Design a protein around this ligand. Structure first.
Ligand code: NDP
Ligand code: ZMP
Ligand code: SF4
Ligand code: SF4
Lengths: 156, 156, 176, 208, 144, 112, 44, 94, 96, 155
C-alpha cells in the first residue's frame, strides 16, 4: 500500500535521525567511566558517529550506566532516568552495572541496573574495552534502525 | 588521553587487560614482559616529554588558568599535616615528604629522582608539582628501562 | 633530592618590566596557546576507522571465555572445579557426573558473564587449558539473560574461536 | 644467600624496642603492653581511657613527633569481651618512623574522640561508627558515611551477612525504589578452605 | 609543487577504487577512501587491506562484505563479521596474515563464522544442562 | 560500667521524651517537604510504634545509644539527606503481609 | 638459551624529561615600537 | 545429536525439556543452543594405539599445551588402558 | 607523517618546536607483533642438591612479635629513630 | 498439563508456580498485574503487539527469565496458541476504550476474547480471567459495553 510505503520511509527517516544523533549523558559512577572517556578519546572518538556527551539529562537521549550502582546511588539514577525525555535508551556498561560484577554479594550494591531502570544493550567487560563500548553503541544504533513505530501506528 | 591509550596498550601487552590487571601479585609479578615491550616503552617515553611540554604551554603560563588556581585552596602545612593529607597535598604546602625516598619500598632506593616541592600551597602549585612529578616519573622510567635485571619474575 | 617548583623571582630591570607589561597588554601567552592549538589542528588525527579498523591487542588479551577441546575432539575440561575455587566473583558453576564412557566430565559449566570480572584466573588455573578467555570482545547482548552462558554456549564459542585461540596460546604458552 | 626470604633489619628492631620502652616508662598509667613485630613495626597497647593522653603525648615532641594520623580503624573479634579493637596508625615525619596504638571497646562503651588531637580522625571515627558499632564521645558530628541513609545494621561486624538483610529495587506500583528482604538468585557458596594440618608451628597455641 | 602531487594522489585514489562509482561506494560504506594492498579475502566476502605507510592503527583495515549468512550487510556492518582467522591479523595480534600462515585444521572448528546474533531468532537462550535431581513417586494405575 | 549519656534509667527516659517530642513536631514538616502521601497521624503512629519497639530495653546505656541513633535519623529527615524512598522504607508497603498463625506458616513454606 | 625481554646491551638511549618550553618572541620594546609605528603610519 | 519426542535437540548431557515442563517456552520464537559435536562419539572414533611396553605415558599432545603427564599400565589384555585426561586408548599388541 | 613541507613548516612554527622529530602517532618504529619464541630463565631454587626447603622456608621463619613491655607480670632519652637528614636541592635543576 | 510446586519465600527470586500469559500487559491494569506476578516470581509470558520499546518498562518488574516477551497477532490464533501453550493461567485484558479503524469494538471485545478463551481451552490452560465493566450489559446502550457483554458470554 502507498500509505504503508510513506509510513515506512518516514520511520526510516526518524530512526536514522535518532540513531545518527545519539547524545549520551555524562553519567559515570565507577571505573568504566575511564574506558568511556577513552572511547571519547581521539583513538575511538565517538563524535564521528554523532555520539556527543551532553550533561543535561533533559538534553540527552541515552544513559550509559558505567559503574557499580550502589543502593545509595540508585534513587538518583532512577530520577535522572525519569527526567530524561523519550525516546530514551539505556546501555549498561561493566559487569558491576550488568549484574553486580565483583560486588554482586555486597550489601550496598544493587545486583544489576536492570532492577532499577530498563536496559537495552548490555556491554560485558570489567572494564569493557572502549572498542567493546563503541560496538555496543553501534548495536544500539542498529536496534534503533530496526524500530517500526510508525509501521505499528499505521497497522492500528 | 592518546598517550593514556598507549600506556593502556602497555598494560594489555603485559597482562591482557587495558586496566584493572592482576599483574602485580604477592611474591612478584604474574608473567614476564612479552618480548619487545621494553623498547616500545622506550619509544613512548622518548616522545612523552614533548606532549607534557605542550600541556604546559597550554596551561602553565595562561592568564586565565593562573587566575582560576593561583591562590585557591590554600592549605597551611600544619593544617595539612593534621588533617591527614598526603602526597602533593603535603608537598604543595612545602613540607618535604615522599615515601619513595623517606621509606623506599621496592627498588626506589636504587633510582634517582627529585621530589617536586611547592611554595604557596595552592592549586596552581599542586598543578606544577603534578607536572614535575610526571617529568620525574619519566626519568625514573628511563632508569628502570636501562637497568632491568635478568631472571625470575616470581618468588622461587 | 627535592626540587622547587615556583620559587623564582622576576627581574626588575626595565627591559624585563617592559616585556611583562607587553605580555599583559598584548596577550602574548594567550597567543602561544593559540599557536599550539593551531599546530595540533594541522597534525594528523589519531582516530581509527572503527569498525573497519580495529585497535591493537596482544596475545594475552582476556575476553569472552571459551571451552576448548583436544585435537581428537574430546572436551578438555576434566571437572576439577579448580576454576570455581579460584573464581574471585563466583561466576563459575560446575556440576559433574561420570559419563557413559566413564570419563570425568562436566554435566553443567555456567559462566555468568554478568558476575565475572574478566580477571584472567581459571585460564591460568585450569590444569588442562580448558576455559581460555578468547580474543573476542564484541559480544554485547540486548538482554541480560544472553550473558548467562551455558556449557553449550561456551563450547560453541570454543569451536568458533579455536583457530585464533590456539594461535594465541601458542604465542604465549612459553611466557606462562 | 637466601634470596627468597625477606632481609631482616635488626637496627630498626632495636630502635623501635627502645622507643617502646621509652613510651612505656613515660606513661605507665595507660600503656598495658608494647611489642615490636619482626617486620619492624611497633605497637603500644593502651587502656581505652588513654586514647587522648597517649596520642597527645605522641604528637608533641617528647622525642616523638607523630603529627600525621595514617589511618584509624577497628577489628571486630567476637570472642573477646571487648569485641572491637580500635587501631591507630601514626607517622612521624621528623623521625621517618611509624608506630601503632591499639585499644579496645565494647558495643556499649564509648571511646573519647580523637578529633581534638589530630583533626583527621573525624571521618575515620564516623566510618568506624557507621561500620562497626563503636560510638565516639565528644565527636563534632557523628553520622553515617559509606552506608545508605536509612541503613539499620552495622556491617563489617562479623555478624552482618555479606549480602545484608535488605535489597533495593524499583517498584512501578509506588513509582519509587523500595527495600525488600534479600533473596539471592545464587546463594554465595561458602568454601571451607582451611587445611586440617598445622602450617606454622611457631604460632602453635598451648594445648590448655 | 606538493599540492599538485596531493591532488593527483586523490585522483589516483578515485581511480584505484574502480572509478567514481566505486569511490562513492567505499566513501559511503566505510567513510575512508584510501587505497591499500589487498592482503586477502575470506570466504564470506570481507576484503582485507594493508598500507604500512599509514600510522599504526590504520595500517590494516577490512571492507566488510555486502552479504553474509543471509543478511544484507551493505549498510549494517559489525565487528563480529570478521572471521576468527583474520581477527588476529586485523587486531594486530599477529603480523602474519592467515593466507601466509593458515590456522591449524581441526574437525570441531566451525566452517562458517556467525556474527553476533542478539536480537535475532538465533539468539542464545540460557537453560539448565542438568537432569532432574529428585524423582517423584508414580501412583499406581489400578484402583486398588 | 561507664555511662554514655545517662547514669540512670530515668535520665535516659527524659532523653527519650525529648527525642519523641522532636520527631512528633517534625512529622508534618516531613510530610510537606517530602511530598509524602501519608497523613500526619499515620506518620506519628509509625513513630509511636518505632518508639515502643525499643520499650522492652532495661539498660540505660542501650537506651542512650538508641537515642543517639534516633537523633541521627531525625537529623537526616530534617535535612533532605534521606530521600522519599528512605522515609517510606518505614512503611513496608511493597512487602506482602506475612501471616503469623501456625497453620498459615505450615501451608506457605518450611520456615519455622 | 635464556631469552627474556631484556634491555639492549648498553641500555636504551637517554630519555628527555625536563621542561623545554622555548624562549620565543621579540623584546617588549620591539613589540611596542612596531605597534606605535603601525599606528603612526595609519594616522598619516 | 538425537531429537527428543517434543522435537527438542537433546544435549550431550542428555538434557531435554519434557512435554509437561513449562520451561520450553523460552525457545518459543528463539533457538535452543546445542553443540552438535559430541565428545563421547569423537573420543570413540579415535583409533586405539598399540604400544609394546607395559607402561606408557600420555601427555595429550603438544607437551606443555596438553594435560599433565600420566603413566598407564597396559598389562590387562581384556581392556585397553584409557588416559584419564585425554581419553585416548592404548593396548599391548596381540 | 604524510604532511606536505608547507604544513610541516606551519605546524612547527606554530608549536615553536620541530614536531616532525617527535610524532605522537606511531609508525614502523613500533616492535613487530610476532616475536621469536621466548625461553624464560629458572630461579635460584632450581637446583638438584643442597636445596632443602627448610633452609629457604621464609614463612616458617616468621615469629610472634617480641613483647618489650607487659603490664601483667640516668637513662638517655631515645627517639623512634635518628632524626631525618634534611633533603638537598637537586643539582640537575634546583629551581623549575 | 503444567503443574509447578511453589518454592521460596514468595520473593522476587521465589517460584510461585503461576505461569501466566497477561494479554494486554502493556495496559494500565497490566502494568500492575505483571508487577504483582513478578514480585511473586510468577513466569509471565507477555504477548505484545507494539514495539518492544513500549514493553521495555515491564522488563524490570520481574527477575531474570521471569518475563518473556513474545509478539502476537490479534487476529491470528496461532499466536494465541504459542503464547498460551505452556501457561497454566491466562488473563485477558484486551480492551480498547476507543474504537480503532482496523479493530472495532466487536473485534477487541468478542472475537479476540473468544479466540483467546477457546485456544486457552485447547492448550489446556487451567484458569482464565476475563475483564468486563460492571456497566457492560447485553442491553447497555454503549456499543462497546454491549460487545463486552457478548464477549463475556462467549468467553
Ligand atoms: N476503568 C478501567 O480501567 C476498566 C477496565 N476494563 C478492562 O480492563 C482491561 C485492561 O484495562 P486497562 O489496562 O486500563 O486498559 P488499557 O486500554 O490501558 O490497556 C488495554 C490493553 O489492551 C491491549 N489491546 C487493545 N486492543 C488490542 C488489539 N486489537 N490487539 C492487541 N492488544 C490490544 C492494549 O495493548 P496496546 O496498548 O499495545 O494496544 C493494552 O495493553 C481491558 O479489557 C478493559 O476494557 C473494564 C472495566 C473498567
Ligand atoms: C516516618 C516515621 C519514622 C519513625 C522514626 C522514629 C525513630 O527514629 S525511633 C528511635 C527511638 N528510640 C528510643 O526512643 C529508644 C527508647 N528506649 C527505651 O528503652 C524506652 O522505651 C524506655 C526507656 C523504656 C522508656 O519507654 P517509654 O517511653 O516510657 O514507653
Ligand atoms: S565492571 Fe569492573 S571496571 Fe566496571 S565498575 Fe565494575 S569493577 Fe569497575
Ligand atoms: S575471569 Fe571471570 S569467570 Fe574467570 S575466574 Fe575470573 S571472575 Fe571467574
Amino acid at each position: 500500500s502507498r500509505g504503508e510505503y510513506v509510513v515506512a520511509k518516514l520511520d526510516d527517516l526518524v530512526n536514522w535521525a535518532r540513531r545518527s544523533s545519539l547524545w549520551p549523558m555524562t553519567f559515570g559512577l565507577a571505573c568504566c567511566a575511564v574506558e568511556m572517556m577513552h572511547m571519547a578519546a581521539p583513538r575511538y572518538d565517538m563524535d564521528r558517529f554523532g555520539v556527543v556527551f551532553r550533561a543535561s539529562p533533559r538534553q540527552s537521549d541515552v544513559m550509559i550506566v558505567a559503574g557499580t550502582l550502589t543502593n545509595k546511588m540508585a534513587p538518583a539514577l532512577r530520577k535522572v532516568y525519569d527526567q530524561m525525555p523519550e525516546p530514551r535508551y539505556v546501555v549498561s556498561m561493566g559487569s558491576c552495572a550488568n549484574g553486580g560484577g565483583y560486588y554482586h554479594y555486597s550489601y550496598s550494591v544493587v545486583r544489576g541496573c536492570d532492577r532499577i531502570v530498563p536496559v537495552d544493550i548490555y556491554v560485558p567487560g570489567c572494564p569493557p574495552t572502549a572498542e567493546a563500548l563503541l560496538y555496543g553503541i553501534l548495536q544500539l544504533q542498529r536496534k534503533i534502525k530496526r524500530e517500526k513505530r510508525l509501521r505499528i501506528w499505521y497497522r492500528r | 588521553f592518546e598517550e593514556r591509550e598507549k600506556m593502556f596498550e602497555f598494560y594489555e601487552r603485559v597482562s591482557g587487560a587495558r586496566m584493572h590487571a592482576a599483574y602485580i601479585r604477592p611474591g612478584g609479578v604474574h608473567q614476564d614482559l612479552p618480548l619487545g615491550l621494553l623498547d616500545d616503552i622506550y619509544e613512548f617515553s622518548k616522545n612523552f616529554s614533548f606532549r607534557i611540554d605542550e600541556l604546559e604551554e597550554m596551561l602553565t603560563n595562561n592568564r586565565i588558568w593562573r587566575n582560576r588556581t593561583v591562590d585557591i585552596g590554600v592549605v597551611t602545612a600544619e593544617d595539612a599535616l593534621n588533617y591527614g593529607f598526603s602526597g602533593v597535598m603535603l608537598r604543595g604546602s612545602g613540607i618535604q615528604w615522599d615515601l619513595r625516598k623517606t621509606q623506599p619500598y621496592d627498588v626506589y632506593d636504587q633510582v634517582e629522582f627529585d621530589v617536586p616541592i611547592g611554595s604557596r600551597g595552592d592549586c596552581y602549585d599542586r598543578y606544577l608539582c603534578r607536572v614535575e612529578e610526571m617529568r620525574q616519573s619519566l626519568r625514573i622510567i628511563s632508569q628502570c628501562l636501562n637497568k632491568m635485571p635478568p631472571g625470575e619474575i616470581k618468588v622461587d | 633530592t627535592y626540587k622547587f617548583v615556583n620559587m623564582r623571582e622576576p627581574s626588575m630591570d626595565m627591559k624585563s618590566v617592559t616585556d611583562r607589561a607587553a605580555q599583559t597588554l598584548l596577550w602574548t601567552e594567550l597567543v602561544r596557546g593559540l599557536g599550539m592549538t593551531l599546530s595540533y589542528l594541522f597534525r594528523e588525527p589519531a582516530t581509527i576507522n572503527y569498525p573497519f579498523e580495529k585497535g591493537p591487542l596482544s596475545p594475552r588479551f582476556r575476553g569472552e571465555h571459551a571451552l576448548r577441546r583436544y585435537p581428537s575432539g574430546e572436551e578438555r575440561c576434566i571437572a576439577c572445579k579448580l576454576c570455581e575455587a579460584v573464581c574471585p566473583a563466583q561466576a563459575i558453576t560446575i556440576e559433574a557426573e561420570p559419563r557413559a564412557d566413564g570419563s570425568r566430565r562436566t554435566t553443567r559449566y555456567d559462566i555468568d558473564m554478568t558476575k565475572c570480572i574478566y580477571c584472567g584466573f581459571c585460564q591460568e588455573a585450569c590444569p588442562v587449558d580448558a576455559i581460555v578467555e578468547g580474543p573476542n570482545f564484541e559480544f554485547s547482548t540486548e538482554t541480560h539473560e544472553e550473558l548467562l552462558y551455558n556449557k553449550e554456549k561456551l563450547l560453541n564459542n570454543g569451536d568458533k574461536w579455536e583457530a585464533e585461540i590456539a594461535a594465541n596460546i601458542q604465542a604465549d604458552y612459553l611466557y606462562r | 644467600t637466601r634470596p627468597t626470604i625477606r632481609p631482616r633489619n635488626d637496627v630498626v628492631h632495636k630502635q623501635l624496642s627502645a622507643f617502646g620502652q621509652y613510651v612505656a616508662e613515660i606513661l605507665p598509667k595507660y600503656v598495658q603492653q608494647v611489642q615490636v613485630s619482626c617486620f619492624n613495626e611497633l605497637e603500644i597497647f593502651i587502656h581505652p581511657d588513654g586514647v587522648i593522653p597517649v596520642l597527645t603525648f605522641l604528637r608533641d615532641h617528647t622525642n616523638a613527633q607523630f603529627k600525621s594520623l595514617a589511618d584509624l580503624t577497628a577489628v571486630d573479634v567476637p570472642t573477646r569481651q571487648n569485641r572491637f579493637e580500635i587501631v591507630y596508625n601514626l607517622l612521624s615525619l621528623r623521625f621517618n618512623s611509624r608506630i601503632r596504638v591499639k585499644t579496645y571497646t565494647d558495643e556499649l562503651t564509648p571511646i573519647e574522640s580523637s578529633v581534638t588531637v589530630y583533626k583527621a580522625a573525624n571521618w575515620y571515627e564516623r566510618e568506624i561508627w557507621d561500620m562497626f558499632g563503636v560510638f565516639f564521645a565528644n565527636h563534632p558530628d557523628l553520622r553515617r558515611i559509606l552506608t545508605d541513609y536509612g541503613f539499620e545494621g552495622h556491617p563489617f561486624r562479623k555478624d552482618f551477612p555479606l549480602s545484608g538483610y535488605v535489597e533495593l529495587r524499583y517498584d512501578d506500583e509506588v513509582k519509587r525504589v523500595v527495600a525488600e528482604p534479600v533473596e539471592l538468585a545464587q546463594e554465595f557458596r561458602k568454601f571451607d578452605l582451611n587445611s586440617p594440618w598445622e602450617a606454622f608451628p611457631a604460632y602453635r597455641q598451648p594445648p590448655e | 609543487m606538493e599540492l599538485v602531487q596531493v591532488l593527483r594522489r586523490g585522483l589516483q585514489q578515485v581511480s584505484g577504487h574502480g572509478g567514481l562509482r566505486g569511490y562513492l561506494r567505499v566513501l559511503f560504506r566505510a567513510n575512508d577512501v584510501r587505497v591499500g594492498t589487498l592482503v586477502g579475502e575470506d570466504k564470506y566476502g570481507n576484503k582485507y587491506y594493508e598500507d604500512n605507510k599509514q600510522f599504526f592503527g590504520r595500517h590494516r583495515w577490512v571492507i566488510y562484505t555486502t552479504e553474509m549468512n543471509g543478511r544484507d550487510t551493505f549498510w549494517d556492518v559489525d565487528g563480529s563479521m570478521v572471521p576468527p582467522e583474520w581477527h588476529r591479523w586485523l587486531h594486530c595480534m599477529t603480523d602474519d596474515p592467515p593466507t601466509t600462515k593458515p590456522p591449524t585444521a581441526r574437525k570441531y572448528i566451525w566452517t562458517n563464522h556467525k556474527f553476533n546474533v542478539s536480537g535475532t531468532p538465533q539468539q542464545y537462550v540460557p537453560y539448565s544442562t542438568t537432569r532432574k535431581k529428585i524423582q517423584e513417586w508414580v501412583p499406581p494405575s489400578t484402583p486398588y | 560500667v561507664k555511662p554514655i549519656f545517662s547514669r540512670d534509667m530515668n535520665e535516659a527516659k527524659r532523653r527519650v521524651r525529648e527525642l519523641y517530642r522532636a520527631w512528633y513536631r517534625e512529622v508534618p514538616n516531613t510530610v510537606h517537604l517530602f511530598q509524602l502521601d501519608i497523613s500526619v497521624k499515620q506518620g506519628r503512629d509509625k513513630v509511636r510504634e518505632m518508639f515502643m519497639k525499643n520499650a522492652h530495653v532495661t539498660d540505660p546505656r542501650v537506651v542512650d545509644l538508641l537515642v543517639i541513633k534516633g537523633k541521627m535519623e531525625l537529623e537526616e529527615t530534617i535535612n533532605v539527606w534521606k530521600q522519599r524512598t528512605h522515609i517510606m522504607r518505614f512503611f513496608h508497603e511493597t512487602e506482602a503481609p506475612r501471616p503469623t498463625d501456625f497453620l498459615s506458616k505450615f501451608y506457605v513454606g518450611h520456615d519455622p | 638459551k635464556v631469552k627474556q625481554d631484556m634491555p639492549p646491551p648498553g641500555g636504551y638511549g637517554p630519555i628527555d624529561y625536563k621542561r623545554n618550553l622555548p624562549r620565543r618572541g621579540l623584546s617588549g620594546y620591539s613589540m611596542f615600537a612596531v605597534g606605535i609605528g603601525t599606528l603612526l603610519f595609519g594616522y598619516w | 545429536v538425537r531429537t527428543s519426542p517434543t522435537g527438542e535437540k537433546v544435549t550431550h548431557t542428555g538434557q531435554a525439556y519434557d512435554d509437561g515442563d513449562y520451561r520450553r517456552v523460552r525457545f518459543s520464537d528463539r533457538q535452543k543452543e546445542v553443540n552438535e559435536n559430541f565428545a563421547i562419539d569423537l573420543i570413540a572414533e579415535q583409533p586405539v594405539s598399540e604400544v609394546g611396553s607395559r607402561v606408557i605415558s600420555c601427555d595429550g599432545g603438544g607437551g606443555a599445551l596438553g594435560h599433565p603427564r600420566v603413566y598407564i599400565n597396559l598389562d590387562k589384555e581384556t581392556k585397553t588402558g584409557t588416559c584419564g585426561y585425554c581419553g585416548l586408548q592404548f593396548r599391548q599388541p596381540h | 607523517a604524510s604532511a606536505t613541507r608547507v604544513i610541516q613548516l606551519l605546524r612547527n612554527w606554530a608549536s615553536g618546536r620541530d614536531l616532525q622529530a617527535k610524532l605522537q602517532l606511531r609508525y614502523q618504529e613500533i616492535s613487530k607483533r610476532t616475536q621469536p619464541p621466548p625461553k624464560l630463565p629458572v630461579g635460584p631454587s632450581h637446583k638438584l642438591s643442597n636445596n632443602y626447603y627448610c633452609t629457604r622456608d621464609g614463612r616458617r621463619e616468621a615469629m610472634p612479635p617480641s613483647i618489650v613491655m607487659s603490664s601483667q607480670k640516668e637513662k638517655k632519652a631515645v627517639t623512634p629513630a635518628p632524626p631525618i637528614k634534611r633533603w638537598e636541592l637537586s643539582k640537575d635543576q634546583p629551581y623549575l | 498439563h503444567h503443574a509447578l510446586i511453589p518454592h521460596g519465600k514468595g520473593g522476587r527470586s521465589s517460584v510461585s508456580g503461576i505461569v501466566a500469559t497477561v494479554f494486554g500487559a502493556t495496559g494500565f491494569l497490566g502494568r500492575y498485574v505483571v508487577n504483582h506476578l513478578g514480585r511473586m516470581g510468577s513466569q509471565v509470558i507477555v504477548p505484545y503487539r507494539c514495539e518492544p520499546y513500549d514493553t521495555m518498562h515491564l522488563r524490570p518488574m520481574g527477575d531474570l527469565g521471569q518475563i518473556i516477551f513474545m509478539e502476537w497477532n490479534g487476529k491470528d490464533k496461532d499466536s494465541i496458541r504459542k503464547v498460551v501453550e505452556h501457561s497454566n493461567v491466562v488473563i485477558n485484558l484486551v480492551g480498547r476504550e476507543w474504537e480503532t479503524k482496523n479493530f472495532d469494538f466487536e473485534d477487541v471485545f468478542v472475537k479476540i476474547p473468544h479466540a483467546i478463551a477457546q485456544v486457552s481451552k485447547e492448550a489446556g490452560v487451567e484458569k482464565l480471567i476475563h475483564i468486563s465493566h460492571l456497566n457492560a450489559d447485553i442491553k447497555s446502550p454503549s456499543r462497546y459495553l454491549r460487545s463486552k457483554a457478548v464477549g463475556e458470554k462467549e468467553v
